[PDB]
Symmetry: D2
Subunit: 311 residues, 4 copies
């Protein structure tokens, strides 16, 4: 049986971290499980320090186990998954899992999610697919997966390109793998980093104030992600502030508040004229992840656009 390490970041999702083999006994039949509690927070409080800790821990311990399961709150699991997708250099399976119902509730989903997460982490076919999220019997790639519903146990979906595989009776039929470069195919190396560039997100809507953008500019933010309207469009005053900021060296990425589809280039905004970058299918919080990492290598917008075209 394979050795699987569970890295916990929050409360339990089934039934300390060493107690999960008791909570979900069937795990014994599929893996030799060891648990470590990395942090214990709600994922609404996820932050750069925990991301760096997780990436370094996985990269350091890669040789000591056959795969990783990370238990994580669902609120920001899609952010952590993509960060790790880009910074983990272990090509053994790394699988994130959470639960939408409390472990104490009727029909709690945590136990079967964890079982299926371990199944996936133990499946040799899961390797080299990047970091994965396993929720509701489905294997999802860390780039495209997103929380689509506030309460549904089926909330996590790779809205644009679909899941990689479905799990039935502890076996996975994989039919897809992400084409975008991940893990050891990216140049992002966080092994020595203590911090990440500062990147904030502003929202666009009718009559939007420019004060959120201005405040981030005034604080010297390295980059700003716009949750635009439609195909990445900006309310005039937010546009104005970000246009000025970009000329001063602020990296500016146009993403969209629209939950599916790509903020494309060659649409309504002349990105080359303004020094902006279009985020593609990356939603604002995912665009932030890649923008922070891009900024550890380049402040040049054309090179950042190239990064957003490859990863």
């Amino acid at each position: 049986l394979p050795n699987i390490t569970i890295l916990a970041t929050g409360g339990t999702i089934a039934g300390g971290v060493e107690n999960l083999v008791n909570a979900v006994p069937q795990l014994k039949d599929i893996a030799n499980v060891k648990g470590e509690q990395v942090v214990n927070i709600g994922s609404q409080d996820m932050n750069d320090n925990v991301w760096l800790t997780l990436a370094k821990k996985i990269n350091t311990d890669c040789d000591k186990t056959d795969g990783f399961v990370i238990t994580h709150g669902t609120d920001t699991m899609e952010e952590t998954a993509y960060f790790l997708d880009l910074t983990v250099k272990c090509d053994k399976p790394v699988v994130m899992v959470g639960a939408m119902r409390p472990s104490t509730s009727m029909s709690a989903d945590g136990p079967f999610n964890l079982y299926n997460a371990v199944v996936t982490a133990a499946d040799k076919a899961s390797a080299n697919r990047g970091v994965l999220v396993v929720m509701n019997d489905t294997v999802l790639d860390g780039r495209d997966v997103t929380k689509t519903n506030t309460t549904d146990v089926a909330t996590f979906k790779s809205v644009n390109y679909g899941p990689l595989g479905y799990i039935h009776n502890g076996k996975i039929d994989y039919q897809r793998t992400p084409a975008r470069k991940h893990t050891s195919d990216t140049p992002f190396d966080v092994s020595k980093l203590n911090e990440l560039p500062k990147v904030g997100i502003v929202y666009n809507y009718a009559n939007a104030s420019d004060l959120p953008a201005k405040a981030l500019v005034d604080a010297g933010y390295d980059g700003i992600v716009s949750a635009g309207v439609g195909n990445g469009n900006l309310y005039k005053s937010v546009f104005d502030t970000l246009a000025t900021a970009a000329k001063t060296g602020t990296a500016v990425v146009r993403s969209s508040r629209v939950p599916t589809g790509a903020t494309t280039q060659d649409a309504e905004v002349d990105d080359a004229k303004y020094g902006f970058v279009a985020s593609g299918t990356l939603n604002p919080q995912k665009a932030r992840v890649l923008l922070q990492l891009a900024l550890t290598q380049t402040k040049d917008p054309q090179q950042i656009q190239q990064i957003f075209n490859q990863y």
Copy 2:
């Protein structure tokens, strides 16, 4: 044939000579209210449309409002709450340029006029008609950045579908709209200041602080999950709510309700949960709620009724 007024707010989405077939279904008159891209939509345009519709209700049988798609879902809900005409009011746009191949404008406008001319469309609130489907202004949202099929009432579904100029309506919104709401903008020249802040890992409190520092009347949080807030943002909005600012917890998550009685003790902090209203829609209702009350309990009641 019904008299239908088209109120234009942007460029043409088609091209009445553009769509001659309108003549077969209505007597169409057009007035250009403003001409802007809807990414620049604003309070002033909203007030103008609501007043124009309420003033001209008796002069026509229904209204079509051509509009850019980017913020159509916001305008539709504002009008859904403030229009007192219960004749059909229908919003429509195009996802492809009117000069492009397989432009969607022409048939979208046609079906929008069909809807506004249909007696059965009355009393259903303000409507959005896109891709052969009639959608209520409360639940409708733009779900994809480029798809002609982008508009969907994601939580409760559409009211009806249009085939060959006929609508089979099977649903009507139960939340109170138009003449069933207390919001009256007839005499207002401005709306309370309400902004939106986004939550995400490591979120800065600076957007929230800047709105507070500017004396905003309300702040809508685009929370994570079921309305949750990053600690720094939580800290600032908790202070705002005890300091005069209405705080509504919505969610960046595209479907489902920011519920009461989850992880945030809204009663303790003075917060309001937005239900299925997404951030930009929650903003619409909060602004209007603030024209009537600043009490968080009374705003929650508004968010439970409209």
Copy 3:
């Protein structure tokens, strides 16, 4: 607390001792009507349920019908048309075995009892409650073979969502149901014979012929696209319709309506278009239509009202 009757048609989906929390929301009494897998569901079970509900309506405050998921969408629509009790009638099942990890039965049953106990659930027709969502028996269908979230009202959306034992109902079906329909099965021991044939490339006419040869009262076509038929199948159903057999064009396509006035001249052939009713649901209504009429125009009217 309301008196709620649970009518079981299969094995347990949970395990009242199984779900003790029911005691907090209702006084639950259980009767096992049949015990079968719903892939074996049949006319006799349908008649029994409709009669039992109509007879015992006055003795209880609402009903939950535990049921296998495979044909739940069929039974729900039959009861939606034939139940004359307008107290809540709620159907529920489980997509995972009650002994498996994270079994969905227990919370599904709990929410089903919540729904049947909610005064606001009355007069909405027969309901299916699955994955925290209240769905009308007409539009609800099983959309995925294994997902706990499989049940969706794909065309018009759900009626309400359930959070913490509370439902926010925002919709109700406009099509006529329960006591608003003329279908009365109180005195019937059998239903007209109606079968379903599938269309696909190179489709054999032999399934259709076999139903005709057996004297079937009606045939539902699971057409391609908007109700279209493979030539051989067309030829046989055209003959059937002129020879005593009611023919309803539905579609294998999982969402959207088989419309009148598309590629098939239904008036010429004596056919009926099923609207948004999929094949198995179209069968339900056609059987009931046939207890009242054989006239294709009158059956089309039924398919436009129910």
Copy 4:
């Protein structure tokens, strides 16, 4: 500019077949287009003869062009696409396209669909992805694509595993390719075949008659696909008839009328006991396609199951 051949099977979808460069002039700017009318039928009348004609024509003419666009009715395009996905041996791009609105209607979708189909057929990156369906700005693989709505121009979706790529401004960001074996990676060779094994489809529902199944058995059908309920389940009398048939050498595949998800093995039906095959995510009409082709190589159910696990 690449040479693209348009094989028409039905009426025009834009604006004879040689007239399409006039109907959609912008095609001139992206390809040298030549059209041939293979048949002219509505796709509700699609049949084995047209499938064989198309596969042989593409395999024969592969060296004479840079890619193929097949114009086809939408009703059965998902069947033809999968048949060709399994029998075309040209790994140059083969793209199917149709229109949901008549060419004469307001906002007809045919013209832009054809343009995008040619874009896809001309994109070198489209090669080696199997046979494709391009509809509503989306590139879909021929195995998973299905018509989900009776009238919506956005009807075609790869419901289980998602699209391969999206098209914006005549360029495609491909992020996925089908893992299941297609085209030159399958053993199905129709070059010499004049007919296909007879395979019919029966539907399951409450109180379902066994007469449709019996009739196909009595006619000596080589195989029967069950559009089962739920996870491939059968009404008792249909079950009985198909169980008997399988013991007599009839190939029996359990698919499902449920529009998404896989008819799995190891669920409610003991397929090994009965000699049945589970169709996986193949819906009934797609299962028919693979079953017919399997039957040109084997009547053994375990080998057919293996085929349904690989293709």
